[PDB]
Amino acid sequence: MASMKKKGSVVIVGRINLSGDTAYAQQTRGEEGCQETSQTGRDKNQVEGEVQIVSTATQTFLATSINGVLWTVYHGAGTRTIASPKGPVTQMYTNVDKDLVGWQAPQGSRSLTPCTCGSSDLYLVTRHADVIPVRRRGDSRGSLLSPRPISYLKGSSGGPLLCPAGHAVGIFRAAVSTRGVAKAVAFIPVESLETTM
Ligand SMILES: COc1ccc2nc(C)c(O[C@@H]3C[C@H]4C(=O)N[C@]5(C(=O)NS(=O)(=O)C6(C)CC6)C[C@H]5/C=C\CCCCC[C@H](NC(=O)OC5CCCC5)C(=O)N4C3)nc2c1
Ligand SMILES: [Zn+2]
Numbered sequence: 010m011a012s013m014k015k016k017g018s019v020v021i022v023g024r025i026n027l028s029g030d031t032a033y034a035q036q037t038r039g040e041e042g043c044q045e046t047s048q049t050g051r052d053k054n055q056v057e058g059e060v061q062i063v064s065t066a067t068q069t070f071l072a073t074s075i076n077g078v079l080w081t082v083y084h085g086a087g088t089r090t091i092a093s094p095k096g097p098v099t100q101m102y103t104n105v106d107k108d109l110v111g112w113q114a115p116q117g118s119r120s121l122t123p124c125t126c127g128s129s130d131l132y133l134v135t136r137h138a139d140v141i142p143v144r145r146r147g148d149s150r151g152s153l154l155s156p157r158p159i160s161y162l163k164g165s166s167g168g169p170l171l172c173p174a175g176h177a178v179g180i181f182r183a184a185v186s187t188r189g190v191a192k193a194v195a196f197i198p199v200e201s202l203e204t205t206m
Contacts, residue, residue, distance in 0.1 A: 016089055017048055018089060018092040019065055019081075019092065021052065022037060022038045023035050023037050023061070024060060025138050028058070033138045034138045044066070047065065047066060049096075050098075056117040057117055061074075061115075063167070068085055070165070071181075074114040074118045074119065075120055075199065075202060077120055078102065078111040078113065080180050081110055082109065082110070082167050082180070083109060085166055086100075099112075107197055107205070109180070109197050111202075121171075121175070121176065124172045126172045126176060128145075128173060129144060130142070130144065132170065133151075135165040135168060136168065137165075145178070150185070150195055152193045153191060153193065157191055161191070166182060167180060167181065168180070168181045177199050180197040180202070181196050
């Protein structure tokens, strides 16, 4: 009881820059400053962009702003708060059944717009700033046009699947692999986010 520890906050440690012609990852905080920010929940760094790279003490993954909510996966964040300039921010959405959590989008973030195109030609954005073409195959599944080892997708849960026009279609949740090769991905459809809201 006296020694009861508390888990740290999720910390923004970088972002995927989709501003220009070339997508690229940027780190905005090193491990040590991430360690201290997770403990205090106090993050003074300027936030920019739609796709953040986030980290706990033991995991790193992505988080994506859609309609004023920073979304990510429950299997990464659990019920953790996120660090912010004035302290830990409690989740405003939690759904273990969808593998989904959300906090209010940070000041300075930009939000993606929910897709209403009805298109099945999608693009998955990874933590290494790869933009991977994906054909939608169902409400929550898409196939990679070019399969690759799951190693290349590890750490990209919470990232977005986008339509051709750059709208958010879903949040990357899991990889479907055969012999360690990712042939398809499962994602939380944006409609399921909009219902949660
Ligand atoms: C605890 O409470 C909950 C509640 C609901 C939950 N719901 C799901 C689906 C779930 O799955 C866990 C976590 C998830 C995952 O690894 N996600 C990725 C990632 O990158 N994570 S991560 O960022 O590195 C990190 C771990 C740091 C956060 C994108 C993957 C990239 C590579 C995967 C390689 C090896 C894993 C293949 C596996 N495949 C699979 O399960 O496929 C089946 C499900 C649908 C199709 C069939 C898979 O993908 N996952 C296993 N845990 C849950 C836990
Ligand atoms: Zn669209």
